[PDB]
């Protein structure tokens with residue numbers, strides 16, 4: 587069994603291992619950091635099965651859960667929320683915050699998403715780049731999703747640097763156990779204060795609804811509200827930042843497609859679809875354990891063994907997406923769903939929100955800055971460590 591997770595082949599590419607596995611060993615065992623063996627699923631059909639099987643559990647502290655690092659064990663000590671639940675507990679709590687993320691709710695949020703993007707881009711225009719390139723991440727990719735979720739949750743914009751820093755320390759593989767633990771607690775303490783404020787004086791935000799609709803009536807306690815707020819604050823935000831940055835790098839890498847997008851910003855939706863398939867910025871989150879013996883592919887997975895379903899590999903499945911390793915926003919989509927946002931009950935609660943933010947970004951960015959260019963050779967882009975999910979730390983640009 588090979589050590590897992592695997593490292594990306596190069597900055598923007600997925601691990602080279604997946605291709606061989608899909609072709610000759612689709613469901614296999616891998617060796618985790620603690621010496622335990624877990625099952626790696628690489629084919630689209632199998633990942634979909636894993637995401638929908640009633641025989642598998644999402645419970646993180648359940649016996650056999652496949653933590654990928656020593657830090658995982660500590661994170662798992664967090665109070666369980668819907669992301670760690672199976673039916674009926676799952677939807678019982680997820681339904682408490684789902685209203686904000688429905689297709690209808692996201693559609694009504696469009697004017698605000700547009701304004702948020704418009705304002706951030708205008709500031710870049712005013713700051714200019716006469717004295718050199720600016721970091722698209724810090725000035726745009728970072729504040730776009732951050733400001734939106736902060737408004738939805740009820741978090742003050744001024745705390746962007748602090749909250750971003752603390753979560754970075756918490757999830758950074760280079761952080762000592764102590765440093766990561768302190769960071770996680772600073773995040774909870776911060777949100778506890780906010781939840782307490784809303785219990786006394788509610789506003790029209792997610793935290794407030796949790797308070798008036800669930801806490802006061804005694805359906806969940808104060809600590810549950812804090813954990814839910816924590817989950818919505820930390821899950822996916824950094825991933826959105828990376829997706830925006832990766833989208834810009836991809837367009838610079840595919841000049842012909844950028845030309846099409848500039849000529850017609852209405853192509854943004856299809857660009858976003860290919861982006862979410864090609865760059866699977868969340869590739870190690872679909873993890874489960876078998877409640878009982880069950881067949882996954884042609885392999886018998888025994889009760890309590892861990893499973894890791896790679897939606898990244900599924901998105902590069904050559905038996906589903908033609909010429910999978912080529913980025914082409916003009917591809918004709920097959921009947922099979924791309925899995926950038928997962929599948930089944932746990933499919934990203936913010937899928938509609940995320941795609942709207944990305945669609946707004948890519949239908950506006952080049953209209954605002956038609957001459958936007960990545961200011962460093964593409965081969966020199968500062969990507970995230972190869973042993974982690976694909977992303978970009980900073981992206982110098984001119985316009």
Ligand SMILES: Nc1ncnc2c1ncn2[C@@H]1O[C@H](COP(=O)(O)OP(=O)(O)OC[C@H]2O[C@@H]([n+]3cccc(C(=O)O)c3)[C@H](O)[C@@H]2O)[C@@H](O)[C@H]1O
Pocket residue numbers: 655656657658660661669670756757758763766767770817820821822823824825868871
């Ligand atoms: N207190 C602590 N002490 C030591 N290490 C700590 C830590 N807290 C986090 N960490 C480390 O950093 C990682 C932090 O992640 P942890 O909180 O599980 O996960 P992360 O914040 O990504 O996500 C929180 C929850 O959302 C889920 N999710 C699904 C799909 C996409 C995304 C997304 O963010 O795009 C998130 C995810 O599986 C998890 O259940 C851990 O795996 C751990 O190694």
Ligand code: HEM
Pocket residue numbers: 637668669670680731735817818819821822823825826829867868871872873897925926927928929931932933934935936937940
């Ligand atoms: C483009 C950026 C994003 C990508 C690619 C993404 C991807 C995913 C994937 C693949 C899952 C499934 C995990 C599993 O099945 O185990 C997931 C779950 C989830 N995501 Fe996202 N996500 C993104 C942004 C967000 C944002 C911005 C939020 C914040 C509101 C978010 C909140 C969640 C939550 C709460 C869950 C767990 C839902 C559940 O268990 O029912 N995601 N996401």
